[PDB]
Symmetry: C2
Subunit: 929 residues, 2 copies
């Protein structure tokens, strides 16, 4: 029964069910159908086993009786390889279904009608300000005129940079199955459904769930080209159409505040970018050829998407009334027109001149087609005979005939028609250009040092690497105005040096609209930035990429201001950057060095300090937000996170990472996609005209004191404990993540931020996110009892503090120290168990101080809808945690034996199970630190 499954699920999540709360119902219906499918595909016995795992896990999540985890363990460790794989597949699949259901629930959850106005309303999707409410607050509360608001938005840019799913790039095919499951589900709850439609939707739902489950081939890692193409799927699914839907909402909002024009179609309000095939930091599989291929793939896809919708527009543009300008152009094209068959779906004969818009758009289609085919031949054959004037090489060439269509309609009395699909198409072109994402390159500073050292030594003038910072600067500036090239044809090159040089060669050869920033990982100094500038000059790149330092460690953040000041003082550099500089911060990176509490506070300060330095030098600064920050959460929390930024750090230009493990939530469902674009646009606009409060001096002082203590605790555990590393390798699947791939790892310091966060997320322990907050809180409270109240006032009143605590609280809600205890017991040697125990004691204490500061008795009592979503996924994740724990034992320990049950599944090893459990646990945990 459905009702019995509803019953079990409902016990897991008490709450106050009104009509729009269907999430438990959705999950029951999906689980019920998936169980039928399992019985069908694999037999009743296997179905009963899955059920039993689910039941035991759900009971355990109810009362947390250890006994239920043991029974779950006994069952799971008795399964053979074949049955283990089916079970891990089953539970992974259920997590995806649950996520789709949750998306549908967020999409249809009722908006709160009367918002209290407190900034806390912007943390929650049901309460946050939409774009019109944002306009109205600025007008009526901050006394901006409608014209000032309109003018600021017209000059605003929001750039979202997509990074790779750290664990499982989802293929286009499966994504589309997920979308259809989500739709069947929505339609089953449509008002006024006939019984036959319900029966047929039911069978469709069943069929899709099965199709997705059976898309499950398990040998080779995915190539970076395939990872990029997978990572681009969301444009087709939602973003492509989502952009003009949101820009049309902006028109509507403008109209409602008394602005009587549309948002200009070519204002570059939204821009997407990518790191897929561009980031080679610690990753030698990202070669110059990879980068070339992803640029051409992005070009091929973009021109293909315009091509694949142009015929629809041609069909609509049947109108025969046009202006002179377009008439003349149409008759030109008509006279030079081919007498014969074009192998297209729709307009295959010659287009007659009384269909003038079709004649214009017919020529655009041919260009799009050739533009697409050139890219394809360049990818597959290594070059192309297709000439430049047969294709679009600049976006202006594509806009022009569309603009001509627009004006001609306007001039003939049809403005209204122009503002339909034509306007949407113009906006798509202006937003995606000829490459729907611009690609950032990233490489670490030491690689550039190595390249330049090879050059200096071959020149016989010494060793760049040995040179002091002052001497580096001096030589770099001399060569940046040099009169001859640096690199001769006999320069000796190691493979790494060659690889780095040849990247610049790809940058010089490809069009500049393929590229965004050149990010320098591990940047520390002025010379790091000049080094990249010299290499671009040496390759004579016609439009050099802007060079963007990423300062990672705490010490690097502290040295950033002097580095930026020095750059800005240099005439060559000032002239080169033309009033603009972008700097990147990496929350997870900095947090791996110094603990998340101190990284958060330091990043607040460093941003303040760089903003001031930029003003002083008359430079416009963009802060590029790397992964791990409150702004990377997605959903409503992102809205308040953005508003929490230090004053003047946005200033009309937002650039943020959309982390791969967040892209599905942010963009998979069309309503969420629309809301995601909206909150980025609204928050960015608001912040420049309505900064949060600046902190009280007492608050800064306490933050400083707390950071010293947090950093000390985090570093004594992570870096000074001589056996932390050995513990970490036993308690987490960190090593196995490595040997089943980027590459991952000199200890934790040389371990990358993603494997660090990921490994502890897998054990439901999350040490990287919380460690250090505990000592900070305790020390503050014990030094002066009054600090408890100060910290509570900061939570209630200082948006930065509020969002910083909320993220840690969400992570604690995804935690379970029973899973970590189980891993200790199974996997850690006896002499290191006390260490694990003492970390669990810190977890508890740190959680409780956080709760006390937030004024909560229970985790997430602020946010019951989020808590509900996390709780409904828990039983699935827990089953995977237990399966994984015993799998790791079997893999590691040739001594370990258990009696195996006879094979359960019909139809009609260990490493594979582990990869399944790792991916499913990650899909259920989504973002943390």
């Amino acid at each position: 029964k459905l009702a019995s499954i509803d019953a079990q699920l409902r016990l897991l999540v008490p709450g106050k069910v009104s009509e729009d709360d269907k999430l438990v119902e959705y999950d029951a219906l999906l689980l019920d159908k998936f169980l039928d499918i399992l019985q069908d595909l694999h037999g009743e016995d296997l179905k009963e086993a899955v059920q039993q795992c689910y039941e035991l896990s759900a009971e355990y999540e109810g009362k947390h009786d250890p006994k239920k985890l043991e029974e779950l363990g006994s069952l799971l460790t008795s399964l053979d390889t074949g049955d283990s794989i089916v079970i891990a597949k089953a539970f992974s699949h259920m997590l995806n279904l649950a996520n789709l259901a949750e998306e549908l629930q967020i999409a249809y959850r009722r908006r709160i009608k009367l918002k209290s106005g407190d900034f806390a309303d912007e943390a929650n999707a049901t309460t946050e300000s939409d774009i019109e409410e944002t306009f109205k607050r600025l007008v009526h509360k901050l006394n901006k005129s409608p014209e000032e608001v309109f003018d600021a938005l017209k000059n605003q840019t929001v750039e979202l940079v997509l990074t790779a799913h750290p664990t499982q790039s989802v293929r286009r095919s499966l994504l589309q199955k997920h979308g259809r499951i989500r739709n069947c589900l929505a339609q089953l709850y449509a008002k006024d459904i006939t019984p036959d439609d319900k029966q047929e939707l039911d069978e469709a739902l069943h069929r899709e769930i099965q199709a997705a489950f059976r898309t499950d081939e398990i040998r080779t890692p995915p190539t970076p080209q395939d990872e990029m193409r997978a990572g681009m799927s969301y444009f087709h699914e939602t973003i492509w159409k989502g952009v003009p839907k949101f820009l049309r909402r902006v028109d509507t909002a403008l109209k409602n505040i008394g602005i009587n024009e549309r948002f200009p179609y070519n204002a570059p309000l939204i821009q997407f970018s990518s790191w897929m095939g561009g980031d080679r930091d610690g990753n030698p599989r990202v070669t110059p050829e990879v980068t070339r291929d992803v640029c051409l793939l992005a070009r091929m896809m973009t021109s293909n998407m315009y091509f694949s919708q142009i015929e629809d527009l041609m069909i609509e543009m049947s109108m025969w009334r046009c202006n002179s300008e377009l008439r003349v152009r149409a008759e030109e094209l008509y006279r030079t027109a081919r007498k014969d068959v074009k192998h297209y779906i729709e307009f295959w004969k010659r287009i007659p001149p009384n269909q003038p818009y079709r004649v214009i758009l017919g020529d655009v289609r041919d260009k799009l087609y050739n533009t697409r085919e050139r890219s394809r031949h360049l990818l597959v054959d290594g070059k192309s005979d297709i000439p430049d004037e047969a294709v679009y090489t600049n976006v202006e060439q594509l806009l022009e005939p569309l603009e001509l269509c627009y004006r001609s309609l306007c001039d003939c009395g049809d403005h209204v028609i122009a503002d339909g699909s034509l306007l949407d198409f113009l906006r798509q072109v202006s937003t995606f250009g000829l490459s729907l994402v611009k690609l950032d390159i990233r490489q670490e500073s030491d690689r550039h040092t190595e390249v330049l050292d090879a050059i200096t030594q071959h020149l016989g003038i010494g060793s760049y690497r040995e040179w002091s910072e002052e001497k580096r600067q001096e030589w770099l500036l001399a060569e940046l105005s040099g009169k001859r090239p640096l690199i001769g044809p006999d320069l000796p090159k190691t493979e790494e040096v060659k690889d780095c040089l040849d990247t610049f060669k790809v940058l010089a050869e490809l069009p500049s609209d393929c590229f965004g920033a050149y990010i320098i990982s591990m940047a520390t100094s002025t010379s790091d930035v000049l080094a990249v500038e010299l290499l671009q000059r040496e390759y004579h790149i016609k439009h050099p990429l802007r060079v963007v330092p990423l300062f990672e460690k705490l010490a690097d953040l502290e040295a950033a201001p002097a580095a930026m000041t020095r750059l800005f003082s240099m005439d060559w550099y000032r002239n080169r950057i033309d009033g603009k500089q972008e700097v990147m911060i990496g929350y997870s990176d900095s947090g791996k060095d110094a603990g998340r509490f101190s990284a958060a506070w330091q990043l607040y300060k460093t941003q303040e300090q760089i903003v001031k330095i930029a003003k002083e030098f008359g430079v416009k600064l963009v802060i590029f937000h790397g992964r791990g920050g409150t702004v990377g959460r997605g959903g409503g929390p992102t809205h308040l996170a953005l508003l929490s930024q230090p004053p003047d750090t946005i200033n009309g230009s937002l650039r943020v990472t959309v982390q791969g493990e967040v892209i599905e939530q942010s963009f998979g469902e069309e309503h969420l996609c629309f809301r995601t674009l909206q909150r980025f646009c609204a928050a960015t606009l608001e912040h420049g005209m309505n900064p949060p409060i600046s902190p009280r001096p007492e608050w800064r002082e306490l933050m400083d004191q707390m950071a010293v203590v947090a950093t000390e605790e985090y570093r004594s555990v992570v870096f000074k404990e001589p056996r932390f590393v050995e513990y970490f390798r036993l308690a987490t699947p960190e090593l196995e993540f490595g040997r089943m791939n980027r590459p991952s790892k000199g200890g934790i310091e040389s371990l990358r931020a993603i494997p660090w966060i990921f490994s502890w997320t897998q054990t439901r322990f999350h040490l990287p996110v919380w460690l250090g907050f505990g000592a900070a809180f305790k020390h503050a409270i014990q030094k002066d009892s009054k600090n408890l109240q100060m910290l509570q006032e900061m939570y209630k009143t200082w948006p930065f503090f509020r969002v910083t605590i909320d993220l840690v609280e969400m992570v604690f809600a995804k935690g379970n120290p029973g899973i970590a205890a189980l891993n200790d017991k199974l996997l850690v040697s006896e002499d290191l168990r006390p260490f694990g125990e003492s970390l669990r004691a810190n977890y508890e204490e740190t959680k409780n101080y956080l709760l006390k500061i937030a004024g909560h008795k229970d985790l997430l009592e602020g946010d019951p809808y989020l808590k509900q979503g996390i709780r409904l996924r828990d039983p699935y994740i827990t089953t995977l945690n237990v399966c994984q724990a015993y799998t790791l034992k079997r893999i590691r320990d040739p001594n370990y034996h258990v009696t195996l049950r006879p094979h359960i599944s019909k139809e009609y090893g260990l490493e594979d199970t582990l990869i399944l459990t790792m991916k499913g646990i990650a899909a259920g945990m989504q973002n943390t630190g």
Copy 2:
């Protein structure tokens, strides 16, 4: 205001508004937006004029005060050419909008839950039996087993033959605009609409209405190729997808009566055919080249439609598990696979062998593409180098790889997935084949006589035309077993004779799956059918088309049985037709000869008589229903019409005309499309197992007596009144319909049935539908007062009689003798006005007898939803009737002058106005006789 427009509209149609009745609301909203658009495009003044015409017409339709028609006349006759055209365009457009609204209302009108079981429930869409209810009645009331019902449906065929819109083939582009207006409208009434969505849908609705209005270019008639392509648009809009949606409902219904398999994908339950480019009866513009072109166009479109959906199926069919058979075929195709770019939207690189279903479907796509391109080159270049094994020449070749995909899924445990899009695709292929319509040829008997007369005289053996029927038969049978060809290279040929011979040449050259029946217009005799058989033999056509006589006049219907008996007695013919014969009837044709009452009754008898003769000779008979019958109404009335057929006249095979003026209603909106397919399938099934009652002898006798009297009255008015023709030319726009084109016209007898019906429909008088019923009723009632009760019992109890009266009653509801009176007064000479008056007196008397027999006080009190729809269109049609009447005066009468108002419209002769009024009046009247 919207509310004020709602108010006026509501007065027109009193009734008992529950929540699902929104039609008045829809019409108000559409008119309100269209008025804004008129003001915008053409100025406030013109908007006020339109409004004023609408207001005056709506008032007139309320109380029928003559004064309101006069004022409407004064206003309209004062407009210049430019303003007249804008006004006629405006009112035509509003009629289309109203029709779209009505469609949406029929689609969402609530079903009656408890049906009374009376056959009268099958006349109305809210009460008719759906396919499952049909199954259940057969099982529980007629004691059929589920298996017997399943088996009869599996052997059933429903063939729908599409004919050309008699007045305005609507182009694809405009059709799609209409669809989007209909959707915006539906979405504006969606439950739980946000205000911004409502504002944006509103602006979208406005924009579409404008786009459709401005698709309005007015020189050349449309070529028959363009008329056919226009006429095929409904496949893309609804029928293509509608077929598998209905066949899936059949699966569901079967399951619900205990049949646990799907309806076989290749049972040929549904077949579409066409006359567009095949009918040349009285139409010399339909040449052999036209026929060749429409066959190739149908082939091109069909393969294009499969091509344009195959990539979607490829995307879904990502599964890697396949059986041996498919594995082997995939590895074959993979080895012989091209290394390089295919210029397709989706799978442009070589498909890998671990995507086996994609490999199979990739090869299908290439074949589809080549099949499509061959047809295109044959059309545009006159031939093609594309060889046979590069394309599909038979449908089996396309089914085979799809069947292989199906089996492989089933064999690997994925039956459920197979039954999704794959199953739909299989059904589409089985239903549309390689030519989505098969083409009937039609030509009149006398043309074949003329051809054979040329042959006999060139041979020196006499004149076929002078030969008696017996001598014709004798010679035809001798030559049908002849040993040498008839036609030598020097046969003298007039253009007509050549044209007729060359059609046979096209039939011999093209594939047989392009063609259906060869219909003989004006058939009278056995030799007429043998004549066509001899010509096909002479051209050595490998699969000769079946020859189908159309017996038109009453005398021809009476001679049909002896003609069929003689054919069936001839061994050569029996052997040729292999147990099957199709005969055609033409309701409108027969009604033009003898009056509609007598044609209806005679057609009932003739069908009975031919059915019996077929049984006796062991031949299966199909009766092909031509236009003008109760079965051509569309909507629910069609359901009872089909059930009304004489016993055994369907017998598992239905063939009916879908008239061009009905196609929009039947197929334009996806729910109506689904319901149309459903009632054809359900009624055909039911009838063979549940014939209506056969009439009582007293009823036959009275029907006979009534026919003698009806025919006499109809013929004395139409054929024996020496000035009827002269009256008809003045009172109707018949002549102008001619000189603005098929061709149209020896008096009424040589006038074609469509111009006859059409001309009287235009004046809202409809003489062809009702004339004769009056004398029949009166004579019956006056001969014996008891006949009134007999006729009422027939109405209540005899489905044939009931449906025959209902059609005439619907036509009276579309009538208005005020419009005919106005035409008399304006257009008819004084000495013929009394004639017109006496016809109006007959109209009134005939209507009243009909009402009395039906037991109604008011027209259509049976069917208030239909009455409501007709009444809401009336004001628009009336404005066009008045405009037309004065336009015809101006065109005909150089003496007629009126003072013209200064030009009203901004922006930024007579013949054109007339064509607009004629098309709009026809679109508002839809089907009558």
